Amino acid sequence: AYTNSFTRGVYYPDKVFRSSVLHSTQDLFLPFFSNVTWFHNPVLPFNDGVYFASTEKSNIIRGWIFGTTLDSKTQSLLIVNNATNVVIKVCEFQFCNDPFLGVNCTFEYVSFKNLREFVFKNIDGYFKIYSKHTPINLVRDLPQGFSALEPLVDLPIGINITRFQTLLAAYYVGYLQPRTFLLKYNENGTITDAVDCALDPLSETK
Amino acid sequence: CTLKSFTVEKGIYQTSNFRVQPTESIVRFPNITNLCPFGEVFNATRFASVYAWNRKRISNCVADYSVLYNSASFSTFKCYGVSPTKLNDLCFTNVYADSFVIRGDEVRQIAPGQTGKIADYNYKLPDDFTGCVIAWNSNNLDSKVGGNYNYLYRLFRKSNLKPFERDISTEIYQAGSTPCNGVEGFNCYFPLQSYGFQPTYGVGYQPYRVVVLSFELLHAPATVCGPKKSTNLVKNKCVNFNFNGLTGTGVLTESNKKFLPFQQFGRDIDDTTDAVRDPQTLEILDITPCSFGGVSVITPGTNTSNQVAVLYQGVNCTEVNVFQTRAGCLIGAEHVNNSYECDIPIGAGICASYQTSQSIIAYTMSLGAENSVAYSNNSIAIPINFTISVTTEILPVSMTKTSVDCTMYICGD
Amino acid sequence: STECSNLLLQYGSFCTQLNRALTGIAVEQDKNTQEVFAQVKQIYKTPPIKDFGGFNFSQILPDPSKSKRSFIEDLLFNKVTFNGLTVLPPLLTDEMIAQYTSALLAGTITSGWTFGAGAALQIPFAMQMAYRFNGIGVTQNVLYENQKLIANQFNSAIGKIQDSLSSTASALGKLQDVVNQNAQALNTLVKQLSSNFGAISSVLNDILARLDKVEAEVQIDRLITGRLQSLQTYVTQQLIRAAEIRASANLAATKMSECVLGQSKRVDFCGKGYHLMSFPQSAPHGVVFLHVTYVPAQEKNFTTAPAICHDGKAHFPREGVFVSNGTHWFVTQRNFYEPQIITTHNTFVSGNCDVVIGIVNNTVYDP
Amino acid sequence: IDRLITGRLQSLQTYVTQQLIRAAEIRASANLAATKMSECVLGQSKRVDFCGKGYHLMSFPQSAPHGVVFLHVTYVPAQEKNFTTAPAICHDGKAHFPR
Amino acid sequence: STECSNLLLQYGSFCTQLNRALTGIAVEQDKNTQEVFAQVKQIYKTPPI
Ligand SMILES: *[C@@H]1O[C@H](CO)[C@@H](O[C@@H]2O[C@H](CO)[C@@H](O)[C@H](O)[C@H]2NC(C)=O)[C@H](O)[C@H]1NC(C)=O
Ligand SMILES: *[C@@H]1O[C@H](CO)[C@@H](O[C@@H]2O[C@H](CO)[C@@H](O)[C@H](O)[C@H]2NC(C)=O)[C@H](O)[C@H]1NC(C)=O
Ligand SMILES: *[C@@H]1O[C@H](CO)[C@@H](O[C@@H]2O[C@H](CO)[C@@H](O)[C@H](O)[C@H]2NC(C)=O)[C@H](O)[C@H]1NC(C)=O
Ligand SMILES: *[C@@H]1O[C@H](CO)[C@@H](O)[C@H](O)[C@H]1NC(C)=O
Ligand SMILES: *[C@@H]1O[C@H](CO)[C@@H](O)[C@H](O)[C@H]1NC(C)=O
Ligand SMILES: *[C@@H]1O[C@H](CO)[C@@H](O)[C@H](O)[C@H]1NC(C)=O
Ligand SMILES: *[C@@H]1O[C@H](CO)[C@@H](O)[C@H](O)[C@H]1NC(C)=O
Ligand SMILES: *[C@@H]1O[C@H](CO)[C@@H](O)[C@H](O)[C@H]1NC(C)=O
Ligand SMILES: *[C@@H]1O[C@H](CO)[C@@H](O)[C@H](O)[C@H]1NC(C)=O
Ligand SMILES: *[C@@H]1O[C@H](CO)[C@@H](O)[C@H](O)[C@H]1NC(C)=O
Ligand SMILES: *[C@@H]1O[C@H](CO)[C@@H](O)[C@H](O)[C@H]1NC(C)=O
Ligand SMILES: *[C@@H]1O[C@H](CO)[C@@H](O)[C@H](O)[C@H]1NC(C)=O
Ligand SMILES: *[C@@H]1O[C@H](CO)[C@@H](O)[C@H](O)[C@H]1NC(C)=O
């Protein structure tokens, strides 16, 4: 199945305060009004990076696995909420072909009513996570509107990634592309609107 | 000297640039935390047999070497490829610590490209090693009465170890001309053997604990670093500064800006960094540049006098007779309450001249005499007489005609 | 960076000739401002009672409650709105410019064209307008007979200037453009510090930390080359931009002399219509002229002839033209219909009737 | 040698650009001097302050090295006196205005 | 060429401010031409005789 992204999935590209200003940036972004794949799990490609989101009220979705093989031959990220908080490991796991939770260690770390949105990207050996948590009034699709995703963690691990899978109900997957965006910062230094410069000739004009 | 002349005509001339120099250097980094647990390497009650040498890998952590080199505890401390004093400034992808027990006479085998029973059969270092070697007498820890035969080393091997090669294989060694059948015999031996350490032995046969430190750097990220030092923080003065990786120089001051909890720097429209968060106490500081501007000399010409006045353009006299104009701090000119036509121009309505024992004076320029025109409803002024006037006007019309042969200017002959 | 400074010396005179160029541009801006406004020898000021024949200058004369700017100058001052960079102040402050526009304006109102040619000779404003009418070939009685109408048309027309300037910022587009181009140029000059120019990094302390001396010197020389080309590009563009402003200040200084201090015969130089006078007002980085002009507004067709016959003599008009309402012939001035009977004083004789192509038979009255 | 060529070429392009900009400033002055000669010397200008201060009578050219000098001859009114004045006078019920 | 284009971005603003300068000169030619010819308000015609 498929759904429109609308204006969703913009994140703060750097740890810099800017106020009452418009800033032009090139980065891996989800393009405006693009297709995102909709699901109710498969192994999926990672490409340049992933936008991920789900609509939730019951904690059916627990975490993610990332790597090249996604199985034993080499190191792989395992990221899980232990129902207290997030846990992270990077071992060469020989885990299940249908992995779930019920309804070697070179690094390790410890941290519907909700839409929970995330962005994953891996650049020069640092793995980046951004997120936002927000209320909702629709189950079938991503809500049309704007709110920027803030950073969570920034992990020096060097591991290659080409595939991922989600630990188990409605969720959405979209792929980042190298795009130029114009970002609007308000008086309090939050991003509050954006323009995808390649979207249409009016956006190129802006 | 600026004009390359011994005579100077009347004017205002820029002779220099002024700049407030930094009074001190500030460095700020986060509170020193995730210090690596070297007590597992150096202070464990257990220790390894040298054939089975125990390696610790350190990652995603801050590793102090100054506690290692300042400690009086060690009977030897050495380094290769690196200065021991420099270690605390460095960062690495991984750091390794390799730990084992040997007799005190054999510690000299743990060195770059060296040879012998311990070097070639237990633990080997390359002819260009980067790292350090640390050792201490362990006679009270590792010897026992009746002989501690529980410590082992490889006495026999088929061939020498490669650099950093680890080997716990039990392969029986054939010294004689007849095969072993997988067990000892005449000139056939089990490879691992003991010193039988006792407290009474001479220092060459007493056990020593040994640690070897090795360093690794890759395009994979520098997960280990030495500890980061920080100074006190100085506000309201021109200072050189470093916050995390951001170097600069400026007057740091308190500010009303509200960064979001993840933000660390603030930027102007022109990219220019204009605020910072202190990583130790999470306040936001404005950065403003240390005061600078042209220095100009105001002179009535060296024909009339050797007095001069100095204008520090845009500078305030706090930063540098002395007089604060809106053009900048003016020094050596007397402020005057009168006003005159502008002789030497300064700026923002101020001019200077040389006037009455005479001195340089600075004044607000006069635009002309005021004149209330005698206008009335019914009265006209008519001239009874005239003057013919002759007015000189000069205009330039042409330059001196010049040509430059670029083939000869750039490279003559 | 003292390490960079020691390499920059190898380029020689370049940093001195860039400051010598920008100093010439900065010193010229005060000459431009002086040549426009400082055209008056004495700071004239207005009588206390405003008996200017019913004309109303209250919105262009000074207001002492405010700087001492006029009501219109306060609209004009509202509608336009450190990596080694500095901004120098002007020599004449915005209060000194408002004293010069006040002196030029008070001289113009109280003494006409005369204050540009010697002493300010006072003349009543109703008579100053009479000689400004007589200067466009409209006979001076046409003012005094219509003086209340003319004063009301002027007082009304100044009211529309206040409304136009109050309504939009796009009135002052030329001055806001000059402000915007200098900001665009400086933001460009500073944003160019973020560029690599082929070096390993755009930050000198990053270069100096990554590399040993002989390698660091080569990466720094790429930043020096690119930043010096970036500053030479700015100085060249400011020299060309200042030449356009100098050409405009020479024109504004010419409209001060020919068109505020005088009355201009030059067509469409001082706005459209036959020019009467104009008033200067100050604005941020500029001057604003309120050009006052006679525009003819209703017209009627007449039969006309180049001469009239009398006793076989051809009569030609001294000042004016011959016209007919259909039954009678009159002579009028050209720019306003005032018909007069044809007489030996209104007309001059030259030769017999038979030469002129299109002469008409009529009568000349001899008083 | 290519460092010397690169520096000397940029040094000469900088000079030629500023001489092109200065030649346009001197041309704008030579076009004004040519206009002052036609209108002030060959004529009598009505243009206020174009040919000196005061009401212009005539002017004379004198040569100078790299330029020209105009000696502008003008009439300046000198000894003003106050009078009472009127726009018109009544005679036999009709207004007379000065011709 | 994509290999060259990625190097040219390291020189920053230069290429944009050259396109902007030539675009300003192009727009000025249509202004120069209307300052001269477009001084008349209405398209006047001569009579047939
Ligand atoms: C870094 O360490 C300092 C010093 O402990 C922390 O600042 C406060 O220091 C005072 C004593 O001067 C204590 O009473 C407070 O409990 C400390 N904490 C706070 C929150 O005030 C500082 O917070 C530490 N910073 C970080 C980022 O850990
Ligand atoms: C000449 O034109 C003016 C236009 O201003 C006419 O003046 C107006 O006349 C009306 C009556 O028709 C008055 O109510 C207005 O007050 C006048 N305007 C002003 C500014 O006072 C004038 O009537 C015209 N005269 C002729 C003979 O056509
Ligand atoms: C206007 O009036 C004069 C004087 O009557 C006309 O003069 C002509 O004079 C010659 C003299 O030899 C006579 O032969 C003609 O008979 C006269 N013309 C007429 C119409 O009688 C003159 O021609 C008249 N002009 C016009 C335009 O009608
Ligand atoms: C992409 O978007 C179109 C509508 O624009 C939709 O029909 C289609 O199903 C979407 N998915 C794919 C893979 O094309
Ligand atoms: C994994 O990443 C390293 C980064 O140095 C690279 O050398 C290697 O080719 C990568 N392998 C794959 C399969 O992407
Ligand atoms: C910004 O912060 C202020 C408090 O400083 C708060 O009142 C305001 O609601 C915030 N949001 C916006 C959009 O200004
Ligand atoms: C070992 O233990 C002592 C006592 O607890 C401690 O003071 C010392 O710093 C430790 N040394 C190392 C190298 O860990
Ligand atoms: C000069 O600096 C002092 C100290 O900051 C301040 O009191 C004074 O107002 C300043 N004056 C000007 C004109 O900058
Ligand atoms: C100028 O005169 C004023 C009169 O109040 C006085 O305050 C000031 O001190 C005088 N300054 C000088 C330099 O005489
Ligand atoms: C002039 O016009 C103003 C309004 O613009 C009015 O207040 C004033 O009374 C009028 N008359 C005089 C003589 O100022
Ligand atoms: C003048 O004459 C022409 C031609 O008969 C006519 O079109 C026009 O309306 C007339 N009236 C005026 C006021 O011009
Ligand atoms: C005007 O044209 C008519 C018709 O051709 C001719 O009779 C007449 O003489 C001309 N009048 C003038 C004033 O040229
Ligand atoms: C004209 O008369 C007034 C009032 O008597 C006087 O102030 C003024 O000085 C006189 N001007 C001349 C030129 O005599």
CSV table of C-alpha atoms in Angstrom, one decimal, chain C residues 32-312:
chain,number,residue,atom,x,y,z
C,32,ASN,CA,28.3,64.4,-3.3
C,33,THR,CA,26.3,65.5,-0.3
C,34,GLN,CA,28.0,68.9,0.0
C,35,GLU,CA,27.5,69.7,-3.8
C,36,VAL,CA,23.7,69.0,-3.6
C,37,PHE,CA,22.8,70.7,-0.3
C,38,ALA,CA,25.5,73.3,0.5
C,39,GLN,CA,24.5,75.6,-2.4
C,40,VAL,CA,23.3,78.4,0.0
C,41,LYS,CA,25.8,80.9,1.4
C,42,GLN,CA,23.7,81.8,4.6
C,43,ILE,CA,21.2,79.8,6.6
C,44,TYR,CA,18.0,81.7,5.7
C,45,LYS,CA,14.9,81.4,8.0
C,46,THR,CA,11.2,82.2,7.5
C,47,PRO,CA,9.2,85.2,8.9
C,48,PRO,CA,7.1,84.3,12.1
C,49,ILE,CA,3.7,85.0,10.4
C,50,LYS,CA,2.9,83.0,7.2
C,51,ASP,CA,1.2,85.6,5.0
C,52,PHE,CA,2.3,83.9,1.6
C,53,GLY,CA,-0.8,85.1,-0.4
C,54,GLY,CA,-2.8,82.0,0.7
C,55,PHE,CA,-0.3,79.4,-0.3
C,56,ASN,CA,0.4,76.9,2.5
C,57,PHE,CA,3.9,75.5,3.0
C,58,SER,CA,3.3,74.2,6.6
C,59,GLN,CA,3.8,70.6,5.5
C,60,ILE,CA,7.3,71.3,3.9
C,61,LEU,CA,8.6,73.9,6.3
C,62,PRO,CA,10.4,72.7,9.6
C,63,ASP,CA,8.4,71.3,12.5
C,64,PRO,CA,10.2,72.3,15.9
C,65,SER,CA,8.4,69.5,17.8
C,66,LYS,CA,10.3,66.7,15.9
C,67,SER,CA,15.2,66.5,14.3
C,68,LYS,CA,13.7,69.8,12.9
C,69,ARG,CA,12.5,67.9,9.7
C,70,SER,CA,9.3,68.9,7.8
C,71,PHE,CA,6.1,66.8,7.9
C,72,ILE,CA,6.9,65.4,4.4
C,73,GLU,CA,10.6,64.8,5.4
C,74,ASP,CA,9.3,62.7,8.4
C,75,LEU,CA,7.3,60.5,5.9
C,76,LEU,CA,10.5,60.2,3.7
C,77,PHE,CA,12.6,59.2,6.7
C,78,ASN,CA,10.0,56.4,7.6
C,79,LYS,CA,9.3,54.9,4.1
C,80,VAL,CA,13.0,53.9,3.6
C,81,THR,CA,14.0,51.3,6.2
C,82,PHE,CA,32.5,42.8,11.5
C,83,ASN,CA,35.1,40.4,10.1
C,84,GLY,CA,37.2,43.6,9.6
C,85,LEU,CA,34.2,45.4,8.1
C,86,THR,CA,33.4,48.9,9.3
C,87,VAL,CA,30.8,51.7,8.5
C,88,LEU,CA,32.0,55.3,8.7
C,89,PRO,CA,29.6,58.2,9.6
C,90,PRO,CA,28.6,60.9,7.0
C,91,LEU,CA,30.3,64.3,7.5
C,92,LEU,CA,26.9,66.2,7.4
C,93,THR,CA,24.5,64.7,9.9
C,94,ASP,CA,20.8,64.2,9.0
C,95,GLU,CA,20.1,67.4,11.2
C,96,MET,CA,22.6,69.4,9.2
C,97,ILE,CA,21.0,68.2,5.9
C,98,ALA,CA,17.6,69.3,7.3
C,99,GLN,CA,19.1,72.8,8.1
C,100,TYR,CA,20.3,73.1,4.5
C,101,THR,CA,16.9,72.1,3.0
C,102,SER,CA,15.3,74.5,5.4
C,103,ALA,CA,17.6,77.4,4.3
C,104,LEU,CA,17.1,76.6,0.6
C,105,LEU,CA,13.3,76.5,1.1
C,106,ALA,CA,13.0,79.6,3.3
C,107,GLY,CA,15.2,81.6,0.8
C,108,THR,CA,13.0,80.3,-2.1
C,109,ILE,CA,9.7,81.3,-0.4
C,110,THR,CA,10.8,84.7,0.9
C,111,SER,CA,13.0,85.9,-2.1
C,112,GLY,CA,12.4,83.9,-5.2
C,113,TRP,CA,15.3,83.3,-7.7
C,114,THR,CA,17.3,86.2,-6.2
C,115,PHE,CA,19.2,84.3,-3.4
C,116,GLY,CA,21.0,82.2,-6.0
C,117,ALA,CA,22.5,85.3,-7.6
C,118,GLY,CA,23.7,87.5,-4.7
C,119,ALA,CA,21.9,88.7,-1.6
C,120,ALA,CA,18.3,87.4,-0.9
C,121,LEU,CA,16.1,90.3,-2.1
C,122,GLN,CA,12.7,89.9,-0.3
C,123,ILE,CA,9.5,89.9,-2.5
C,124,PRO,CA,5.8,89.1,-1.7
C,125,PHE,CA,4.9,85.5,-2.6
C,126,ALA,CA,1.9,86.6,-4.7
C,127,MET,CA,4.3,88.8,-6.8
C,128,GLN,CA,7.0,86.1,-7.0
C,129,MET,CA,4.4,83.8,-8.5
C,130,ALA,CA,3.4,86.6,-10.9
C,131,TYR,CA,6.9,86.8,-12.3
C,132,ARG,CA,7.1,82.9,-12.5
C,133,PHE,CA,3.8,83.0,-14.5
C,134,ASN,CA,5.2,85.9,-16.7
C,135,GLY,CA,8.3,83.6,-17.2
C,136,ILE,CA,6.2,80.9,-18.9
C,137,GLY,CA,4.5,83.4,-21.3
C,138,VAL,CA,1.2,83.7,-19.3
C,139,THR,CA,0.5,87.4,-18.5
C,140,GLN,CA,0.8,88.2,-14.8
C,141,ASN,CA,-2.8,89.4,-14.5
C,142,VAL,CA,-3.8,85.7,-15.0
C,143,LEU,CA,-2.3,85.0,-11.5
C,144,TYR,CA,-3.9,87.9,-9.6
C,145,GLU,CA,-7.3,87.4,-11.1
C,146,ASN,CA,-7.2,83.7,-10.2
C,147,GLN,CA,-5.0,83.9,-7.1
C,148,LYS,CA,-7.4,82.0,-4.7
C,149,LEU,CA,-8.0,79.3,-7.3
C,150,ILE,CA,-4.2,78.9,-7.9
C,151,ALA,CA,-3.5,78.9,-4.1
C,152,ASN,CA,-6.2,76.2,-3.5
C,153,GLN,CA,-4.9,74.0,-6.4
C,154,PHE,CA,-1.3,74.3,-4.9
C,155,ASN,CA,-2.6,73.6,-1.3
C,156,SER,CA,-4.6,70.6,-2.6
C,157,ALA,CA,-1.7,69.2,-4.7
C,158,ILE,CA,0.7,69.2,-1.7
C,159,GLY,CA,-2.1,67.2,0.2
C,160,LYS,CA,-1.9,64.5,-2.5
C,161,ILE,CA,1.9,64.2,-1.9
C,162,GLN,CA,1.3,63.4,1.8
C,163,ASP,CA,-1.3,60.8,0.9
C,164,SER,CA,0.9,59.2,-1.8
C,165,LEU,CA,3.9,59.0,0.5
C,166,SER,CA,1.7,57.8,3.4
C,167,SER,CA,0.2,55.0,1.3
C,168,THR,CA,3.3,52.9,0.2
C,169,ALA,CA,7.1,52.2,0.6
C,170,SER,CA,7.3,51.6,-3.3
C,171,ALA,CA,7.2,55.5,-3.7
C,172,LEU,CA,11.0,55.7,-2.7
C,173,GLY,CA,12.1,52.7,-4.7
C,174,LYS,CA,15.4,54.3,-5.9
C,175,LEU,CA,16.7,55.0,-2.4
C,176,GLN,CA,15.6,51.6,-1.0
C,177,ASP,CA,17.4,50.0,-4.0
C,178,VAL,CA,20.7,51.8,-3.1
C,179,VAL,CA,20.3,50.5,0.5
C,180,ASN,CA,19.5,47.0,-0.6
C,181,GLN,CA,22.4,46.7,-3.1
C,182,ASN,CA,25.0,47.7,-0.4
C,183,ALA,CA,23.5,45.2,2.1
C,184,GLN,CA,23.5,42.5,-0.7
C,185,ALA,CA,27.1,43.2,-1.5
C,186,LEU,CA,28.3,43.1,2.2
C,187,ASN,CA,26.3,39.9,3.0
C,188,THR,CA,28.0,38.3,-0.1
C,189,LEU,CA,31.4,39.5,1.0
C,190,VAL,CA,31.0,37.9,4.5
C,191,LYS,CA,29.3,34.7,3.3
C,192,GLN,CA,32.4,34.2,1.1
C,193,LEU,CA,34.5,33.5,4.3
C,194,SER,CA,32.6,30.1,4.6
C,195,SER,CA,34.0,28.9,1.2
C,196,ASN,CA,36.9,26.4,0.8
C,197,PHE,CA,38.5,27.7,-2.4
C,198,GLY,CA,39.9,24.1,-2.8
C,199,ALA,CA,41.6,24.1,0.7
C,200,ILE,CA,41.0,21.1,3.1
C,201,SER,CA,38.8,23.4,5.3
C,202,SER,CA,37.4,27.0,5.3
C,203,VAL,CA,38.7,27.5,8.9
C,204,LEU,CA,42.4,28.4,9.5
C,205,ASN,CA,42.6,26.8,13.0
C,206,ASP,CA,41.3,23.5,11.5
C,207,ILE,CA,44.0,23.7,8.8
C,208,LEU,CA,46.7,24.5,11.4
C,209,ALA,CA,45.5,21.6,13.6
C,210,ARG,CA,45.3,18.9,10.8
C,211,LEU,CA,48.6,19.7,9.0
C,212,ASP,CA,52.3,20.2,9.5
C,213,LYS,CA,53.8,23.6,8.6
C,214,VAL,CA,54.8,23.0,4.9
C,215,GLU,CA,51.4,21.4,4.1
C,216,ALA,CA,49.4,23.9,6.2
C,217,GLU,CA,51.1,26.8,4.3
C,218,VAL,CA,49.8,25.4,0.9
C,219,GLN,CA,46.2,25.1,2.2
C,220,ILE,CA,46.3,28.6,3.7
C,221,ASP,CA,47.6,30.1,0.4
C,222,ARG,CA,44.4,28.8,-1.3
C,223,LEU,CA,42.2,30.6,1.3
C,224,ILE,CA,44.4,33.8,0.9
C,225,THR,CA,44.1,33.6,-2.9
C,226,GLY,CA,40.3,33.1,-2.8
C,227,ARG,CA,39.6,35.7,0.0
C,228,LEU,CA,41.8,38.3,-1.8
C,229,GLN,CA,39.9,37.6,-5.1
C,230,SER,CA,36.6,37.9,-3.1
C,231,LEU,CA,37.7,41.3,-1.7
C,232,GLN,CA,39.0,42.6,-5.1
C,233,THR,CA,35.6,41.6,-6.6
C,234,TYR,CA,33.8,43.6,-3.9
C,235,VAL,CA,36.0,46.8,-4.2
C,236,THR,CA,35.7,46.7,-8.1
C,237,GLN,CA,31.9,46.4,-7.8
C,238,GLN,CA,31.7,49.3,-5.2
C,239,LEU,CA,33.9,51.5,-7.5
C,240,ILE,CA,31.5,50.9,-10.4
C,241,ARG,CA,28.4,51.4,-8.1
C,242,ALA,CA,29.9,54.7,-6.7
C,243,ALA,CA,30.3,56.0,-10.3
C,244,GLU,CA,26.5,55.6,-10.8
C,245,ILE,CA,25.8,57.5,-7.6
C,246,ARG,CA,28.2,60.3,-8.5
C,247,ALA,CA,26.4,60.7,-11.9
C,248,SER,CA,23.1,61.0,-9.8
C,249,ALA,CA,24.6,63.5,-7.3
C,250,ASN,CA,25.8,65.6,-10.2
C,251,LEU,CA,22.2,65.6,-11.6
C,252,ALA,CA,20.7,66.4,-8.1
C,253,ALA,CA,23.2,69.3,-7.7
C,254,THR,CA,22.1,70.5,-11.2
C,255,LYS,CA,18.3,70.3,-10.2
C,256,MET,CA,19.2,72.2,-7.0
C,257,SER,CA,20.8,75.1,-9.0
C,258,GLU,CA,18.6,75.2,-12.2
C,259,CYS,CA,15.3,74.2,-10.8
C,260,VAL,CA,15.1,75.1,-7.1
C,261,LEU,CA,17.4,78.2,-7.1
C,262,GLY,CA,15.9,79.4,-10.5
C,263,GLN,CA,13.2,78.7,-13.0
C,264,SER,CA,13.9,76.3,-15.9
C,265,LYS,CA,13.1,76.8,-19.6
C,266,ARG,CA,14.4,73.2,-20.3
C,267,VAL,CA,11.4,71.0,-21.3
C,268,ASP,CA,10.5,68.1,-18.9
C,269,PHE,CA,13.7,68.7,-16.8
C,270,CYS,CA,11.6,69.9,-13.8
C,271,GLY,CA,8.5,67.6,-14.3
C,272,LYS,CA,5.9,67.9,-17.0
C,273,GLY,CA,4.1,71.2,-17.8
C,274,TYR,CA,5.6,74.7,-18.0
C,275,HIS,CA,7.7,74.9,-14.8
C,276,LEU,CA,7.0,77.5,-12.1
C,277,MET,CA,9.2,76.4,-9.1
C,278,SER,CA,10.3,73.4,-7.0
C,279,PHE,CA,11.0,72.6,-3.4
C,280,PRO,CA,13.8,70.3,-2.0
C,281,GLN,CA,13.1,67.8,0.8
C,282,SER,CA,15.7,65.5,2.4
C,283,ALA,CA,15.4,61.7,2.4
C,284,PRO,CA,17.7,58.9,3.6
C,285,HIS,CA,20.8,58.9,1.1
C,286,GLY,CA,18.9,61.2,-1.4
C,287,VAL,CA,17.0,64.4,-2.2
C,288,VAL,CA,13.4,64.7,-3.2
C,289,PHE,CA,12.1,67.6,-5.4
C,290,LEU,CA,8.4,68.7,-5.3
C,291,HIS,CA,8.2,70.2,-8.9
C,292,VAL,CA,5.4,72.8,-9.3
C,293,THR,CA,4.2,73.3,-12.9
C,294,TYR,CA,1.5,75.0,-15.0
C,295,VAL,CA,-0.5,72.4,-17.0
C,296,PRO,CA,-3.2,73.7,-19.5
C,297,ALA,CA,-6.3,71.6,-18.8
C,298,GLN,CA,-9.4,72.5,-20.9
C,299,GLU,CA,-9.2,73.7,-24.6
C,300,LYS,CA,-11.5,75.0,-27.4
C,301,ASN,CA,-11.0,75.2,-31.1
C,302,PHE,CA,-10.8,78.5,-33.1
C,303,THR,CA,-10.4,79.6,-36.7
C,304,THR,CA,-7.0,81.3,-37.0
C,305,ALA,CA,-4.9,83.4,-39.4
C,306,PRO,CA,-1.2,84.4,-39.6
C,307,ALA,CA,-1.9,88.1,-40.3
C,308,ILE,CA,-4.9,90.5,-40.9
C,309,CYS,CA,-5.3,93.0,-43.8
C,310,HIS,CA,-6.4,96.5,-43.0
C,311,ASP,CA,-5.8,99.5,-45.4
C,312,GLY,CA,-3.9,97.1,-47.7
